[PDB]
Design a protein around this ligand. Structure first.
Ligand code: A1H9V
Length: 164
């Protein structure tokens, strides 16, 4: 049973205009089986639009490609992103009053490198408000997080979304 194709795609921006379907494929096949690989071109001139997409056979292969950034393709560092609101920070809601920093760190550190955890407290009383923000060093962490159907932290079913 195959993961949905949309979750196996990487949009690659910043291409060299000399990158082709074939040279994009030869590069990104280092991290998995590619079922599709296309450079976007002008319909009349055939000149590259400077971006394209690759489709891997599995999500773990997408992860491997993202973990191998930075990618220099045909002499140019490109910008891969999963199938964009590119942010490094998430809102985590539903954590109630008993969730602490280490609960959030232990869970979210497996999505990416954490730089800030902010457990929100009431301005007047100091009581925990039941939500938090986590800032990572890179957007792919957030992209992986928000496509999951579920997040369970400290026994709580959490609401997680991109923040600003
Ligand atoms: C470079 N990466 C492996 S990452 O920092 O995005 C990461 C850390 N844990 N999961 C992903």
């Amino acid at each position: 049973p195959k993961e949905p194709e949309q979750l196996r795609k990487l949009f690659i921006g910043g291409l060299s205009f000399e990158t082709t379907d074939e040279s994009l494929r030869s590069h990104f096949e280092q991290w998995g089986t590619l079922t599709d690989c296309v450079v976007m071109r002008d319909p009349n001139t055939k000149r590259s639009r400077g971006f394209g997409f690759v489709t891997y056979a599995t999500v773990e292969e997408v992860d491997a490609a993202m973990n191998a950034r930075p990618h220099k393709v045909d002499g140019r560092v490109v910008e891969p992103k999963r199938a964009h609101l590119t942010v490094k920070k998430i809102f985590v809601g539903g954590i109630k009053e008993d969730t602490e920093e280490h609960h959030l760190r232990d869970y979210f550190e497996q999505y990416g490198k954490i730089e800030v955890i902010e457990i929100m407290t009431d301005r007047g009383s100091g009581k925990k408000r039941g939500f938090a923000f986590v800032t990572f060093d890179d957007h792919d962490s957030v992209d992986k997080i928000v496509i999951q159907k579920y997040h369970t932290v400290n026994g709580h079913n959490c609401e997680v979304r991109k923040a600003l």
